[PDB]
Design an enzyme around this catalytic site. Structure first.
Site, PDB file in Angstrom:
ATOM      1  CB  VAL A  91      -3.066  23.159   4.935  1.00  0.00           C
ATOM      2  CG1 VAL A  91      -4.378  23.804   5.366  1.00  0.00           C
ATOM      3  CG2 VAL A  91      -2.169  24.181   4.276  1.00  0.00           C
ATOM      4  N   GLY A 100       0.742  -1.243   0.000  1.00  0.00           N
ATOM      5  CA  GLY A 100       0.000   0.000   0.000  1.00  0.00           C
ATOM      6  C   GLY A 100       0.765   1.282   0.000  1.00  0.00           C
ATOM      7  CG  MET A 138       4.927  14.047  -6.927  1.00  0.00           C
ATOM      8  SD  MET A 138       6.396  14.789  -6.067  1.00  0.00           S
ATOM      9  CE  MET A 138       6.977  13.381  -5.006  1.00  0.00           C
ATOM     10  CB  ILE A 168       1.186  17.379   3.400  1.00  0.00           C
ATOM     11  CG1 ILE A 168       0.940  16.588   2.101  1.00  0.00           C
ATOM     12  CG2 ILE A 168       1.464  16.447   4.587  1.00  0.00           C
ATOM     13  CD1 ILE A 168       2.120  15.819   1.568  1.00  0.00           C
ATOM     14  CG  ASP A 196       4.396  10.253  -5.512  1.00  0.00           C
ATOM     15  OD1 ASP A 196       3.532  10.837  -6.191  1.00  0.00           O
ATOM     16  OD2 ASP A 196       4.315  10.186  -4.272  1.00  0.00           O
ATOM     17  CG  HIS A 210     -33.761  21.762  -4.441  1.00  0.00           C
ATOM     18  ND1 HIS A 210     -32.876  22.814  -4.375  1.00  0.00           N
ATOM     19  CD2 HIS A 210     -34.674  21.979  -3.463  1.00  0.00           C
ATOM     20  CE1 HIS A 210     -33.234  23.630  -3.399  1.00  0.00           C
ATOM     21  NE2 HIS A 210     -34.321  23.145  -2.829  1.00  0.00           N
ATOM     22  CB  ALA A 251      -3.384   8.543  -4.071  1.00  0.00           C
TER      23      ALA A 251
HETATM   24  C1  LIG Z   1       0.652  12.883   4.984  1.00  0.00           C
HETATM   25  C2  LIG Z   1       0.374  12.638   3.514  1.00  0.00           C
HETATM   26  C3  LIG Z   1      -0.928  12.870   3.018  1.00  0.00           C
HETATM   27  C4  LIG Z   1      -1.250  12.655   1.689  1.00  0.00           C
HETATM   28  N1  LIG Z   1      -2.543  12.863   1.252  1.00  0.00           N
HETATM   29  C5  LIG Z   1      -2.892  12.634  -0.075  1.00  0.00           C
HETATM   30  C6  LIG Z   1      -4.224  12.804  -0.521  1.00  0.00           C
HETATM   31  O1  LIG Z   1      -5.140  13.158   0.231  1.00  0.00           O
HETATM   32  N2  LIG Z   1      -4.476  12.548  -1.839  1.00  0.00           N
HETATM   33  C7  LIG Z   1      -3.514  12.135  -2.770  1.00  0.00           C
HETATM   34  O2  LIG Z   1      -3.818  11.932  -3.930  1.00  0.00           O
HETATM   35  N3  LIG Z   1      -2.221  11.964  -2.338  1.00  0.00           N
HETATM   36  C8  LIG Z   1      -1.910  12.201  -1.024  1.00  0.00           C
HETATM   37  N4  LIG Z   1      -0.586  11.990  -0.605  1.00  0.00           N
HETATM   38  C9  LIG Z   1       0.424  11.534  -1.605  1.00  0.00           C
HETATM   39  C10 LIG Z   1       0.221  10.093  -1.998  1.00  0.00           C
HETATM   40  O3  LIG Z   1       0.330   9.301  -0.832  1.00  0.00           O
HETATM   41  C11 LIG Z   1       1.274   9.698  -3.036  1.00  0.00           C
HETATM   42  O4  LIG Z   1       1.168  10.505  -4.197  1.00  0.00           O
HETATM   43  C12 LIG Z   1       1.161   8.272  -3.541  1.00  0.00           C
HETATM   44  O5  LIG Z   1       1.411   7.334  -2.495  1.00  0.00           O
HETATM   45  C13 LIG Z   1       2.140   8.048  -4.682  1.00  0.00           C
HETATM   46  O6  LIG Z   1       1.974   6.690  -5.078  1.00  0.00           O
HETATM   47  P1  LIG Z   1       3.133   5.773  -5.605  1.00  0.00           P
HETATM   48  O7  LIG Z   1       2.485   4.492  -5.854  1.00  0.00           O
HETATM   49  O8  LIG Z   1       3.833   6.355  -6.795  1.00  0.00           O
HETATM   50  O9  LIG Z   1       4.257   5.735  -4.456  1.00  0.00           O
HETATM   51  P2  LIG Z   1       4.465   5.350  -2.875  1.00  0.00           P
HETATM   52  O10 LIG Z   1       3.113   4.853  -2.431  1.00  0.00           O
HETATM   53  O11 LIG Z   1       5.145   6.505  -2.109  1.00  0.00           O
HETATM   54  O12 LIG Z   1       5.447   4.198  -2.887  1.00  0.00           O
HETATM   55  C14 LIG Z   1       5.240   2.928  -3.461  1.00  0.00           C
HETATM   56  C15 LIG Z   1       6.040   1.823  -2.678  1.00  0.00           C
HETATM   57  O13 LIG Z   1       7.318   1.620  -3.257  1.00  0.00           O
HETATM   58  C16 LIG Z   1       8.080   0.875  -2.283  1.00  0.00           C
HETATM   59  N5  LIG Z   1       9.497   0.769  -2.770  1.00  0.00           N
HETATM   60  C17 LIG Z   1      10.334   1.810  -3.111  1.00  0.00           C
HETATM   61  N6  LIG Z   1      11.517   1.392  -3.535  1.00  0.00           N
HETATM   62  C18 LIG Z   1      11.462   0.008  -3.473  1.00  0.00           C
HETATM   63  C19 LIG Z   1      12.414  -1.016  -3.818  1.00  0.00           C
HETATM   64  N7  LIG Z   1      13.624  -0.766  -4.310  1.00  0.00           N
HETATM   65  N8  LIG Z   1      12.035  -2.336  -3.633  1.00  0.00           N
HETATM   66  C20 LIG Z   1      10.786  -2.617  -3.136  1.00  0.00           C
HETATM   67  N9  LIG Z   1       9.836  -1.701  -2.798  1.00  0.00           N
HETATM   68  C21 LIG Z   1      10.217  -0.396  -2.986  1.00  0.00           C
HETATM   69  C22 LIG Z   1       7.838   1.717  -1.032  1.00  0.00           C
HETATM   70  O14 LIG Z   1       8.239   1.091   0.153  1.00  0.00           O
HETATM   71  C23 LIG Z   1       6.347   2.035  -1.151  1.00  0.00           C
HETATM   72  O15 LIG Z   1       5.542   1.184  -0.338  1.00  0.00           O
HETATM   73  C24 LIG Z   1      -0.232  12.197   0.762  1.00  0.00           C
HETATM   74  C25 LIG Z   1       1.077  11.958   1.245  1.00  0.00           C
HETATM   75  C26 LIG Z   1       1.391  12.160   2.592  1.00  0.00           C
HETATM   76  C27 LIG Z   1       2.803  11.860   3.035  1.00  0.00           C
HETATM   77  C1  LIG Z   2     -41.955  16.329   3.818  1.00  0.00           C
HETATM   78  C2  LIG Z   2     -41.584  16.559   2.367  1.00  0.00           C
HETATM   79  C3  LIG Z   2     -40.250  16.330   1.943  1.00  0.00           C
HETATM   80  C4  LIG Z   2     -39.846  16.534   0.616  1.00  0.00           C
HETATM   81  N1  LIG Z   2     -38.515  16.318   0.234  1.00  0.00           N
HETATM   82  C5  LIG Z   2     -38.101  16.546  -1.089  1.00  0.00           C
HETATM   83  C6  LIG Z   2     -36.755  16.362  -1.487  1.00  0.00           C
HETATM   84  O1  LIG Z   2     -35.871  15.991  -0.696  1.00  0.00           O
HETATM   85  N2  LIG Z   2     -36.433  16.623  -2.800  1.00  0.00           N
HETATM   86  C7  LIG Z   2     -37.324  17.047  -3.764  1.00  0.00           C
HETATM   87  O2  LIG Z   2     -36.943  17.255  -4.882  1.00  0.00           O
HETATM   88  N3  LIG Z   2     -38.637  17.225  -3.404  1.00  0.00           N
HETATM   89  C8  LIG Z   2     -39.029  16.984  -2.086  1.00  0.00           C
HETATM   90  N4  LIG Z   2     -40.384  17.194  -1.731  1.00  0.00           N
HETATM   91  C9  LIG Z   2     -41.344  17.645  -2.799  1.00  0.00           C
HETATM   92  C10 LIG Z   2     -41.177  19.096  -3.154  1.00  0.00           C
HETATM   93  O3  LIG Z   2     -41.499  19.839  -2.016  1.00  0.00           O
HETATM   94  C11 LIG Z   2     -42.105  19.450  -4.302  1.00  0.00           C
HETATM   95  O4  LIG Z   2     -41.789  18.672  -5.465  1.00  0.00           O
HETATM   96  C12 LIG Z   2     -42.015  20.916  -4.770  1.00  0.00           C
HETATM   97  O5  LIG Z   2     -42.321  21.847  -3.721  1.00  0.00           O
HETATM   98  C13 LIG Z   2     -42.951  21.145  -5.959  1.00  0.00           C
HETATM   99  O6  LIG Z   2     -42.786  22.512  -6.297  1.00  0.00           O
HETATM  100  P1  LIG Z   2     -43.927  23.443  -6.855  1.00  0.00           P
HETATM  101  O7  LIG Z   2     -43.262  24.737  -7.020  1.00  0.00           O
HETATM  102  O8  LIG Z   2     -44.558  22.888  -8.097  1.00  0.00           O
HETATM  103  O9  LIG Z   2     -45.098  23.456  -5.763  1.00  0.00           O
HETATM  104  P2  LIG Z   2     -45.288  23.830  -4.193  1.00  0.00           P
HETATM  105  O10 LIG Z   2     -43.907  24.307  -3.752  1.00  0.00           O
HETATM  106  O11 LIG Z   2     -45.985  22.699  -3.431  1.00  0.00           O
HETATM  107  O12 LIG Z   2     -46.246  25.014  -4.198  1.00  0.00           O
HETATM  108  C14 LIG Z   2     -46.028  26.307  -4.785  1.00  0.00           C
HETATM  109  C15 LIG Z   2     -46.854  27.419  -4.018  1.00  0.00           C
HETATM  110  O13 LIG Z   2     -48.092  27.703  -4.693  1.00  0.00           O
HETATM  111  C16 LIG Z   2     -48.954  28.326  -3.732  1.00  0.00           C
HETATM  112  N5  LIG Z   2     -50.307  28.372  -4.313  1.00  0.00           N
HETATM  113  C17 LIG Z   2     -51.076  27.297  -4.696  1.00  0.00           C
HETATM  114  N6  LIG Z   2     -52.238  27.664  -5.204  1.00  0.00           N
HETATM  115  C18 LIG Z   2     -52.233  29.044  -5.149  1.00  0.00           C
HETATM  116  C19 LIG Z   2     -53.195  30.014  -5.552  1.00  0.00           C
HETATM  117  N7  LIG Z   2     -54.362  29.707  -6.104  1.00  0.00           N
HETATM  118  N8  LIG Z   2     -52.874  31.349  -5.351  1.00  0.00           N
HETATM  119  C20 LIG Z   2     -51.663  31.690  -4.782  1.00  0.00           C
HETATM  120  N9  LIG Z   2     -50.705  30.810  -4.382  1.00  0.00           N
HETATM  121  C21 LIG Z   2     -51.035  29.499  -4.586  1.00  0.00           C
HETATM  122  C22 LIG Z   2     -48.773  27.418  -2.530  1.00  0.00           C
HETATM  123  O14 LIG Z   2     -49.297  27.946  -1.347  1.00  0.00           O
HETATM  124  C23 LIG Z   2     -47.269  27.134  -2.555  1.00  0.00           C
HETATM  125  O15 LIG Z   2     -46.534  27.930  -1.662  1.00  0.00           O
HETATM  126  C24 LIG Z   2     -40.812  16.986  -0.377  1.00  0.00           C
HETATM  127  C25 LIG Z   2     -42.145  17.216   0.030  1.00  0.00           C
HETATM  128  C26 LIG Z   2     -42.542  17.018   1.372  1.00  0.00           C
HETATM  129  C27 LIG Z   2     -43.979  17.305   1.703  1.00  0.00           C
END
Ligand SMILES: Cc1cc2nc3c(=O)[nH]c(=O)nc-3n(C[C@H](O)[C@H](O)[C@H](O)COP(=O)(O)OP(=O)(O)OC[C@H]3O[C@@H](n4cnc5c(N)ncnc54)[C@H](O)[C@@H]3O)c2cc1C
Ligand SMILES: Cc1cc2nc3c(=O)[nH]c(=O)nc-3n(C[C@H](O)[C@H](O)[C@H](O)COP(=O)(O)OP(=O)(O)OC[C@H]3O[C@@H](n4cnc5c(N)ncnc54)[C@H](O)[C@@H]3O)c2cc1C
Ligand SMILES: NC(=O)c1ccc[n+]([C@@H]2O[C@H](COP(=O)([O-])OP(=O)(O)OC[C@H]3O[C@@H](n4cnc5c(N)ncnc54)[C@H](O)[C@@H]3O)[C@@H](O)[C@H]2O)c1
Ligand SMILES: NC(=O)c1ccc[n+]([C@@H]2O[C@H](COP(=O)([O-])OP(=O)(O)OC[C@H]3O[C@@H](n4cnc5c(N)ncnc54)[C@H](O)[C@@H]3O)[C@@H](O)[C@H]2O)c1
Lengths: 472, 471
Positions: free
Chosen positions: A189, A40, A324, A187, A318, A450, A326
């Site tokens: 940061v 790894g 450099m 790193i 790397d 949404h 993953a």
């Molecule tokens: C603290 C930290 C945080 C990081 N966070 C991220 C991140 O969030 N995202 C990201 O993309 N990258 C991150 N990185 C960088 C990432 O880990 C490296 O880019 C990645 O490991 C490079 O992969 P690699 O396979 O080329 O080399 P490495 O994984 O460094 O090494 C491959 C292996 O080669 C082996 N090896 C070397 N020479 C020999 C040999 N002669 N014989 C046998 N085995 C050998 C080593 O022992 C090692 O295990 C981070 C690095 C550090 C140090």
């Molecule tokens: C508990 C719950 C959870 C939900 N979670 C999600 C979710 O995670 N994701 C998602 O995509 N959808 C979700 N929905 C559905 C989403 O709320 C509806 O799809 C969306 O509000 C439809 O939009 P609309 O604008 O057509 O109508 P609505 O927002 O229902 O209504 C538009 C407005 O028209 C007004 N109105 C109606 N008739 C008249 C009138 N004659 N004169 C004046 N004003 C009027 C109403 O009072 C209302 O305020 C959820 C619904 C509920 C009940």
């Protein structure tokens, strides 16, 4: 007792292990060699994985100990931090995932060889165990996936106790009173914020003027910094750490000064995190003998099929160019092996997203404003704040915004930068958009659910496209 | 005495979004609302208040339960201040409702507070509370009246002890035992919220699966399994005969098997009647105007969302198509855009569905039952969140990602997610669907490591190539 394979992968990090599995699944007799006790590599054992765990727990600690949960009707007596149990969760996860790779190797017929591999021939790899043990592998191909190691700071020596690297930072025995981080890269940061959340007085001293490292969009970076400072994370930007030395009392003194001329002052802390980068690791791989010269940064140069100077020897991850990260390493492992199987090999580092798992999260893919300017590209900008996004408001976590950069005339998305909740997961949608060569109009018209954070992403594209979003 | 270009009746997701976009297009727009606030069902008594309660109840559960302790966040006593949890909810709602007041203001949309009625083919009269009126002459009328709770004959909702989703969102005390009629998305979400808080919950469903219409059955079954082990009980294939409020305050709910027989009775402290919603059009003047409703009470419209009367349109819950907020918003925008001359085009196949429980459930496209029914030759790619790095690191690994791809073109026909981050994740699937993307397309797209999106990416790889990397 030599063993023969079609593909011998050196390194079991993200690049290596993913490549070994893919090669095996493509029909290649595959061998993966690893010097460490577990598979790894960096990411899983001392990087991404253990860090994201601490990041997740510390953040929840913050919501419980702080005012967030209280504001939801979740009333607690005394909120106590059990640093041992918190580290356990981290280790439990790291153990499972390492074990996961061991099983995948078995499921896919991947032969795991434990030892330090060295290329002893155009078609031979020799792995030496700690016990002098030896195992030879005659192989048609060799895939170097050796990875990286922390970049050492000359003058300061790390003891992974009070003077740590990212590895030691991930395992501190107790919360340090005062902590100072050298470098404000991603790193630094993340770790810095982990401990800050847990009670530590933290300060990051950066030589550059922004926080977040290379490529981050400047606007995002300053807005991110602002939010982090408002949390307690302190920054000393445009300041160079010249050296450090541990006091007879136990604390450590860090001598710093302005990045250019020096307003040379000193600071003191409980723990010092040396986080100035990582560098490619190719120690004793046998490269110098083969004739495979490294580039200036120490990387193995390769062609579009990830082939070194010697066509049956490849390198990814790397140790080669590109961000450099993953996911970058795993993608290169996969396409390299597909190439060996004859197929196309493609990767565009511009579509390789970046994520900062702090809270708010930070994520981006494509270009930053600065990159477009230094490139001369004409572009438009769309912005949408999470304060106007319903899922974010209902959740009462409205920090940040989505910022979309589109080409002035083609309306094509050039970059997406997300500062706020869900950024890490959201960038992947952006990534899919860039691959298809999406336009801001295209995205704005895709029906988004949404209420979801992704709606901000949709509105920012619409703002860039039509000129105005709907809820802002 | 007042005039306009576009007059929209209803400030719901469809209405307020339509109104705004109409104004941004260069129309003199007026929005008519009968209630004390703008936002419709979703914002005041629907999506917004329920997602807030779902979010707060999950955190109460993680804190009061054992999750937080396993993380080193030890707490002596964890008590539920129901009063404050509702407050947080109320705040969010209030803020967002005011946000629509500001937005309407910002886009110079005219807000008329009253019960509107189509009095003239180019006129709408809004009769306020105090009887005072306000007439509006307009070129176009956009009906966005929405829906209301579908009652259950025999059972009368008093919103105190026998409630609807509205009363359920504001229960004064956590019920000891609670019975939900109907296991569609709304009832499952509301049921899970109270289950988490302390109530003994049992949902009674006529059909043999939870989650409403369109959900994928395998996903439904696994979803029910997880909820059941959380304490949420279900009685599928059970018809609720009737129910009576007893002198001791208790409530007796009569039930039988859908196929008749097996008579039983369930007693609870609160009854939530959640058997759906229906389009609202009462006294709008259609009954008079010549607008005949369909058998379900919906206003028939063409592809530009206009009724029999060419200048009168209807969108959202009062029209056919899934009754979701985002579906109503998209229709509103394309309808006013259609008014201004543009093209009008929507494919309800690309409209996603999300269940905000924990685990979350999200899907877009087609279910396996749908593909089978249509004779489509497809491939399935499944990936469990238990092999996902972020899921495992977060120690929250229920569920999986399920992809359905067309065998011949590798086109993604349907995406189904049961687990963490589903609600957000589904939007990456909606984008793919929109371009006719393949499972391979998604599999080769570089996803950040480690993220949940990687489960999605791996499920696609499984579908396209036959095998994932991490499972
Ligand atoms: C603290 C930290 C945080 C990081 N966070 C991220 C991140 O969030 N995202 C990201 O993309 N990258 C991150 N990185 C960088 C990432 O880990 C490296 O880019 C990645 O490991 C490079 O992969 P690699 O396979 O080329 O080399 P490495 O994984 O460094 O090494 C491959 C292996 O080669 C082996 N090896 C070397 N020479 C020999 C040999 N002669 N014989 C046998 N085995 C050998 C080593 O022992 C090692 O295990 C981070 C690095 C550090 C140090
Ligand atoms: C508990 C719950 C959870 C939900 N979670 C999600 C979710 O995670 N994701 C998602 O995509 N959808 C979700 N929905 C559905 C989403 O709320 C509806 O799809 C969306 O509000 C439809 O939009 P609309 O604008 O057509 O109508 P609505 O927002 O229902 O209504 C538009 C407005 O028209 C007004 N109105 C109606 N008739 C008249 C009138 N004659 N004169 C004046 N004003 C009027 C109403 O009072 C209302 O305020 C959820 C619904 C509920 C009940
Ligand atoms: N020559 C090389 O090996 C080389 C060159 C460029 C980039 N990289 C690598 O690219 C990856 C990403 O780049 P990154 O910039 O985000 O690295 P990073 O995230 O580790 O950032 C480290 C930070 O340390 C700062 N720094 C260095 N010395 C300092 C000092 N004395 N005082 C204060 N601040 C100091 C740097 O400005 C940098 O911002 C890293 O692994 C980095 O090592 C390597
Ligand atoms: O999607 P969607 O529109 O179905 O979500 P919905 O909110 O409409 O789901 C409500 C559920 O109530 C169920 N139902 C109605 N009357 C019932 C009764 N008497 N007993 C048991 N169940 C009953 C329906 O089957 C439906 O699945």
């Amino acid at each position: 007792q030599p063993i023969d394979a079609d593909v011998t992968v050196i390194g079991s990090g993200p690049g290596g292990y993913v490549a070994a599995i893919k090669a095996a699944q493509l029909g290649f007799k595959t061998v993966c060699i690893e010097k460490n006790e577990t598979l790894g590599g960096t990411c899983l054992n001392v990087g991404c994985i253990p860090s994201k765990a601490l990041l997740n727990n510390s953040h929840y600690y913050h919501m419980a100990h702080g005012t967030d949960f209280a504001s939801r009707g979740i009333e607690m007596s005394e909120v106590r931090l059990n640093l041992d149990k918190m580290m356990e969760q981290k280790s439990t996860a790291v153990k499972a995932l390492t074990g996961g790779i061991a099983h995948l190797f078995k499921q896919n017929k991947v032969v795991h060889v434990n030892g330090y591999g060295k290329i002893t021939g155009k078609n031979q790899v020799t792995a030496t165990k700690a016990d002098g043990g030896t195992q030879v592998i005659d192989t048609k191909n060799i895939l170097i996936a050796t990875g990286s190691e922390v970049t050492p700071f000359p003058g300061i020596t790390i003891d992974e106790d009070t003077i740590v690297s990212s590895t030691g930072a991930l395992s501190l025995k107790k919360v340090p009173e005062k902590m100072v981080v050298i470098g404000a890269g991603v790193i630094g940061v993340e770790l810095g914020s982990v401990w800050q959340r847990l009670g530590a007085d933290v300060t990051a001293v950066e030589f550059l003027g922004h926080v977040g490292g290379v490529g981050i969009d400047m606007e995002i970076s300053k807005n991110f910094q602002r939010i982090l400072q408002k949390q307690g994370f302190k920054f000393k930007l445009n300041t160079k750490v010249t050296g450090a030395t541990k006091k007879s009392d136990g604390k450590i003194d860090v001598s710093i000064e302005a990045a250019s001329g020096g307003k040379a002052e000193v600071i003191t802390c409980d723990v010092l995190l040396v986080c100035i980068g990582r560098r490619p690791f190719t120690k004793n791989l046998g490269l110098e003998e083969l004739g495979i010269e490294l580039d200036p940064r120490g990387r193995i140069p390769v062609n579009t099929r990830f082939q070194t100077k010697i066509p049956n020897i490849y390198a990814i991850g790397d140790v080669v160019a590109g961000p450099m990260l993953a996911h970058k390493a795993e993608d290169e492992g996969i396409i390299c092996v597909e190439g060996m199987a004859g197929g196309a090999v493609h990767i565009d580092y511009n579509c390789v997203p970046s994520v900062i798992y702090t809270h708010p999260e930070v994520a981006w893919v494509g270009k930053s404003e600065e990159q477009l300017k230094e490139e001369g590209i004409e572009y438009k900008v769309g912005k949408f704040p999470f304060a106007a996004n319903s899922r974010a408001k209902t959740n009462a976590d409205t920090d940040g915004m989505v910022k979309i950069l589109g080409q002035k005339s083609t309306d094509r998305v050039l970059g997406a930068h997300i500062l706020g909740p869900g950024a890490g997961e959201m960038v992947n949608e952006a990534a899919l958009a860039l691959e298809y060569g999406a336009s801001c109009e295209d995205i704005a018209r895709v029906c988004h659910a949404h209420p979801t954070l992704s709606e901000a992403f949709r509105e920012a594209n619409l703002a860039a496209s039509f000129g105005k979003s709907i809820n802002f």
